[PDB]
């Protein structure tokens, strides 16, 4: 891990930006994945899956 | 070097949690859904005499 250490951990200012980037990108990656599991576990039960949606007289 | 990499992973989450809790309190002061539900309508009016104004 020392090659990684030499680019990011040497200065705290970079290492702080590394933690902010990982907070951003890590949070987005979990958001997408949790939503994909929810879609796959609830097939057909969504609002866009109402067959007569838009056809109320 | 391995230790600092392992610690940064948990540091991603602490920052994410801190951001989420701060933004929850901030946006709770924003306009509520009922308030936003009364922001568009039309009203009609008539005619008034010269040199005067009506509010």
């Amino acid at each position: 891990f020392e090659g990684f250490y030499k680019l990011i951990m040497r200065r705290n200012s970079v290492y702080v930006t590394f933690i902010i980037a990982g907070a951003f990108f890590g949070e987005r990656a979990v958001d997408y994945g949790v939503h994909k599991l929810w879609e796959r576990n609830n097939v057909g039960k969504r609002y866009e899956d109402i067959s007569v949606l838009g056809q109320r007289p | 070097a391995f230790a600092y990499f392992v610690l940064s992973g948990g540091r991603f989450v602490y920052a994410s949690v801190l951001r989420l809790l701060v933004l929850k309190l901030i946006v709770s002061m924003s306009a509520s859904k009922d308030v936003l539900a009364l922001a568009s309508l039309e009203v009609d009016l008539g005619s008034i005499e010269p040199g005067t104004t009506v509010t």
């Binding site: 200065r11 200012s13 970079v14 930006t17 902010i20 907070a23 | 951001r19 933004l23």
Partner: peptide
Amino acid sequence: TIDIQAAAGWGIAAAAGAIWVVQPFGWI
């Protein structure tokens, strides 16, 4: 000649943080 580098590196940290707390992608 490092104080200018520490300033530039902490400004990048400040800019990344600002884009992170407020995420104005819809406004850019």
